[PDB]
Isethionate-binding periplasmic protein DctP
Amino acid sequence: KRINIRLAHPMAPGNNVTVGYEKFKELVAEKSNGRVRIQLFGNCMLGSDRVTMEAAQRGTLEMASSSSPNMANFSKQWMVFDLPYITSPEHQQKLYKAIDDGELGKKLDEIAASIGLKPIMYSEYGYRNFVTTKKPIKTADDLKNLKVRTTDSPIEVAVAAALGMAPTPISWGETYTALQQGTVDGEGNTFSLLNDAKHTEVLKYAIDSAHNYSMHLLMMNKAYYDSLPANVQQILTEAGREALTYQRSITSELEKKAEDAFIEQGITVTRLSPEERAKLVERTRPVWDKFKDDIPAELIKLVQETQQ
Ligand SMILES: [Cl-]
Ligand SMILES: [Cl-]
């Protein structure tokens, strides 16, 4: 009568999200005295982010994790979290609280249910920063005319355009070559993903722009969740909440470690002045009006309430 629950996700061994799911597995095993077992299938072993979330939504997999921008393959409401400067690291504990215990978390539960899903962990996945191979970036104006790799996220593209940059959507697999060969001048990502992907080798400058925020959303198929005994639901819910407390902290530690690696490898990491941050915020705010008709005002308001 052991319950085997399969959990797929895209992330590499030792990544902050992976470690969170290892913690989740451990806690589910402890709380259930081994009666419930999470079977981990990381590093895209069951497919890409979209493939495994499709499977979780349809019920051929019990659980999957998708980045918040990729949750756009499934619903549009999640776009709220991609808006430039809707959140900043200073207010992160309040954001977490609101997701964990507040109206925001309840709304997100409702949205997930509408697409066949039950949230279990809102894994931290960090704030992206601009980096370059050769052109020094220390100011907002330094970003003008920079050729910058993007994902296929429309908000990412619009942000770059708003800052006067020249966005080029390139697949992840083509990105290192593009940086190395000079078909783009830079990119925007977390230091840990860049260091872990060894893009560090080809970079020379970084700014703490923090111009995008994202999470990695661990979801369970809702019909499957609703089929479980209450005690097993509770074990999963609690394991998720507890693992997330560790995962958010581990993320901070790994991001520090990645920034130190940048500095060790000779990358100049500029701490933006107040004046320059404010330019980034104001230049990117028109993006919110561009996408206004696609993101519910109520959701924007719940996220903004966490930042006051
Ligand atoms: Cl049990
Ligand atoms: Cl892409």
Notes: The two ends are 49 Å apart (CA to CA). The CA atoms of residues 20 and 245 lie 9 Å apart. The pocket of chloride ion (ligand 2) is lined by residues 151-152, 171-172 (CB under 6 Å).
